[model samples]
Target chain A: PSIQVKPLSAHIGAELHGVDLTRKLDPSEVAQIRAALLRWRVVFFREQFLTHEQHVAFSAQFGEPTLGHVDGHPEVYSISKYQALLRPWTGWHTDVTAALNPPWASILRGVTIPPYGGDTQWTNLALAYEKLSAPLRAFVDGLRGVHRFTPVLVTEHPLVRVHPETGERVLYVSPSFLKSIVGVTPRESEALLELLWEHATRPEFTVRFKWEAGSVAFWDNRATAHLAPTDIFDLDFDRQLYRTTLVGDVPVGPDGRQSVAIEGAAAVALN
Target chain B: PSIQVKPLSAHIGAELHGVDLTRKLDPSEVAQIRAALLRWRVVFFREQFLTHEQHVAFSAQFGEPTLGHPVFGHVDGHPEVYSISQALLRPWTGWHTDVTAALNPPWASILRGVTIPPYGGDTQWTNLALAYEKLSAPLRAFVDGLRGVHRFTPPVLVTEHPLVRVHPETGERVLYVSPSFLKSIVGVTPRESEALLELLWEHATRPEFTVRFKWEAGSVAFWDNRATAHLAPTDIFDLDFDRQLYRTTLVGDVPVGPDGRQSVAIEGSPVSAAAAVALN
Candidate 1:
């Protein structure tokens, strides 16, 4: 049941070889996949013709399975190609940060995929944050960031948050929900965040995973951000995939208190 | 039949010189020029000698002009006229959708030259209608359902306009925004805004859909503001040149989107019912 870790790039994603996810795994095999997931941030599997239930079972090994979406009998969240022209969302993000506690991880499987072009890339936030200068690191450790879903739905997180399990500093700021940093000039926060955005996306710390039919991608939602180029929309082919997330915990700061949502009576819902 | 319409680029400016503007135009000449203006969006006329009174007289043939501007001083004698004086040291092609802060931006704008540089400041325009058509149908459908906020600083105003606009005159859909004026789209994350703006701005200003206008002292230029967006050259702006020009802008109606949504004024009241199109 031993699995080998294969690097997709120098620092970000990896491929798990010698393991199949469709069927039940021995305790040793589960350990290998969990360890690989922690190291790589995102791990990819190819040629697993997993049934819906089998996919759900595999996800439960790492964390408690949550609704793929909060609405309906939503155990299975169907993914499909965005109409080539209606592509407002590109592939760059960490999922569902609007909640007080966001998801821990996501398992996505390819159903229908393009021959080429629908590739996704994941960037390692922990690795990216580690590259910062010590003074820069010290400066951010005490700063707090504000993220919002609606004007009334807001959460504050430290600029440098430590992963609860892995005990690594994760750059907690994202261009996605991160609205502003507490106690800084607008220009100052903007300059600092922009630097991190560009830093996290550097090719040296990222890996590109090419998708094929039956390919699967499992990513740590806590320490990575990803982007897929919308260039796929320009192609004539169709792309389809499926994803399910595991419920997450309250994010914590490096100095170690839980990062909590603070808006009073906000219109919050899980997705 | 008498007007010579030679296009300067695939979907941009054209040179029309068959009819003289100093003399009153025949109905046939007017019809031909208007048709060309609609198709090309911007048309150029060369060697027209007209007095200030004649300039006013010629402009009256098309549509009404706006105030000199909301803030800029009016040209001394003719309050409706604005004089443009600037030069480009080098060529620049930053794209823009003009006057998004105004409740009713111009429907059309005409610029005629008073002085020309020795060798620089050629303006360029791209067809926004063509920019939208070039997008994949899926993106076209998606943007049609979206709106973005536009914020202007000098007067400190804000407004919301649809991502896709339906041209009032031609019934074409335009990607009705520019990076110059767009702050963010409605209901999307800032991360989303950054990438979307970068992609669309780069695509809309691609060189293929543009025509370069070379400035001459007697050269006159006209454009339908609704169907096009333009970039002025920075190259000549850096160089030493006296670039004097006269512009008369037409008022326009509140813009309507493909889905029939009207542009909402988030700041400032309407200057007047939108008026547009000027003649030189």
Candidate 2:
């Protein structure tokens, strides 16, 4: 069967209208959907109910699945509670940057939605890069952000990772994960972090997604940042959905560049 | 004439009844009002029919009138347009910090509220010494050692002094002015200014304003910052009001201190020697 794919936005997201995800997928059809995920960054499907086991099985077809963070998921390693509903009119931020290797892609199927609100927004990093001034782009290119999983998790892993796909160097900074920018004094690091945060979420680079039950979305973590709105608080109906992430390889920088390895990148910088 | 003073908040503000501003004031009475200002910080008087000239004349009784900043005023060097109505909310940093040595204390006041919202727009100010404790005492002492430059114009007249400032009247070391217009520190490098500005602004607004003013049509409010900093909230009402201000300035002394700790008692300081006399 020829699967019909509808575009949700210019840079990412697609609704795979005709495909039914609940039934066991044929090897060929699963391969086709996997190919679509790599190209489109996100894939969606409609009108199918799925069990926790089937959801994980379908997600494993794309890549390895890491367990959701314990704080956000009460089931810990199990996929018992599959759907995540964000509260209304919340602040914008990317998916957990606190992870050592942030997920390369995430597939979410909306199982339930309210009558209104609960929109998710995604910002295209590629477009953000295009809009930068030459000097700013050059400045960012020289920086290698050290990513870690410290404050967000009990254990910490410091890794200086570059975007696996986008050649542009990201600060790899998240509000919770990053303790400080390397090579700068504590005060300087705080200032730099504030500046980077202001630049990262410029409104011109984003697109929003409103959900319908049974619609599935797969997004590229490397090229985009996503935000879920908390605006559907009053909708008496509970919102539910299932999510799966495709694990990515350790990141490498442009031209295989390596810099001085700094230890304890997760420690709070002293002034 | 009997003047009735009523407290407006738990910490600050007073409603002064039976005061007329359209006529010129006796110097002794003006002095008494100034003394009340230093004590109360913000004083409210109702039903003053003040014209532009009368307002200026009333403000002049306490001291010399300083020119209003060009950003909020209708024209350069005009002081009569000082009453801030709901419409004046558009201007940036439209709050009161202090009368630094750069421009003396714009003493006395006459603000007539021709129109006002049903509720919401009110001005607030906090005691600086109280704000200091919210920070580490060491940081507070460190702040006192510094002097900030006070500027009247945008580019020129901008001077850098210390972080901790000595109030000319009280001799108390307050956090000088806020970080909004502070360009840089005297000895600090350009990059250091960014960090210090961030820290100082965070330290100053620590939730201890002495009073807040909720205005009614025809109400007038006056304040003295030698005691506190004032803020005006920009909550626009359904209808706009004609808010006007008439202000004058009292010359101030260069900041000084004994041992590093600035004094807070107004009577002990020379700039506020008049404060003691006015109260009597």
Candidate 3:
């Protein structure tokens, strides 16, 4: 069936209808989905409870599927309340920035949904970069930031990166993994980061989604930053979701330089 | 007579009673008024129909009086008294700390209502010192080290003022971004300056930091121009009634910042003796 697209906001997200995730996508349907994803940065589908095998099969059609970090499933990064309680991270992030090549895109399906108040938000970093004053936009084009997942992995990525597909400038720093801007004093880094982080997540650049059972969100990780619900911890409920990511190439800067790994090995696809 | 102070809001203004403004003030009364001005940032009085001479006399008790304005005309034969009449002069509407383009803007501005409309035309004042305190600690620190360019067109005056100013007498920090006169923050990109200034302007004029005063025929408002920003009423012109006020300003010292730096005149002289001499 032909896809029906409804945009959620002026900048970031859209809800796409008429595609069945339970079935393998044809090449024409995949092309249509890819176009929608590129235009909206993120797309949502409601009420598609695909099994783990079906999720993997559908995701593999786009790009090579990477292994889940939790190890129980090869393709599914299953997040339950128990695992979240043990190692909880908050605030905005693009997935796995610590890797030499962070995931290009991420797909998640809601399994155990909360009654209310667990909404994820995504912001358009490309639009955020464009909104900056011309001089500031030029200044950040040459700057790079160090992203770390602590003790294990660290990679330096351009603070302003050029999108390989669209040639758009994207602000690439996330509050969760960004350590510091390269070539600036620590105090300057703090102030500048605070300014950029706050500016990037402003209401005008963001779209929010509340998960329902069988709801799925597919987002281009290279052009957007997302936040998990911070309010879920206080509520008395269980929440679970499954995520799969496509393998990404090293990000290129506006100056033609590519991201460099400072520590740890590059991620390998398991399936 | 002992003055009774009634606060208008938690941060900014107070209404004072018991002493009349038209009569000469005793040293004790003047000290009390000074104390009220220091604590409240602005003080208001009811039923004060002061003549130009009386207004000048009352204002002179506070500080050295400058010529009424740099670019505007004052009351005939009274250089210290500025006449604000809707029929005679166009209003400079919107929020501002008056004449910040001058290095030494007026320290205190005394405005007395003479022919106020029965409704509308209320003035509002915001406490800049309180506005600074309400900001997140990091933002306060960031602005403390920055300065902004303030400009006035027509006569073409420009001065650089600290984004955060330290009050000379009270030693309080004030977020000094007055929306009407500020041009840009120094050393930041124009968009960054715009973003920061927009954030500050919105925060500084928040309802909690301000007080609105409804004017009557004989009311008076005395504001510490260094510690507060005020909005002149834009709704006055829609009504047919004429509004007139007599104002006198005490000369101010060049503003100094928390970093021990003073304001710099970029394109024009401070509103000092030289500018006062030109008022002739």
lDDT of 1 by residue, B208-255 (tens): 555556677888888887877787655454467788878877777888
Better of 1 and 2 by TM-score: 1
**Residue-level lDDT tens digits of model 3 in B138-167:** 999999999999987643678899988899
Name the runs in model 1 displaced over 4 angstroms: A1-271, B70-73, B86-93, B269-280
Model 2 misplaced stretches (Cα beyond 4 Å)? A1-271, B23-32, B67-110, B119-121, B132-136, B150-155, B189-193, B237-280
DockQ list for all candidates: 0.01, 0.02, 0.01
- How many backbone clashes does every candidate have? 30, 30, 0
| lDDT ranking, high to low | 3, 1, 2
Candidate 3 local lDDT, A1-271, one digit each (tens):
4998877655568898999999988888999899999998999999999888888888899998886354556778777767221111136788888877888998999999875546687889998899788999999998999998853788999999789999999999876888899999999998888778867765446676768899999999889998776556656778988888898989989999999999882233210
Candidate 3: deviation at residue A184, Å?
1.9
Residue A112 lDDT, candidate 1, scale 0-100 = 86
Ranking by TM-score: 3, 1, 2
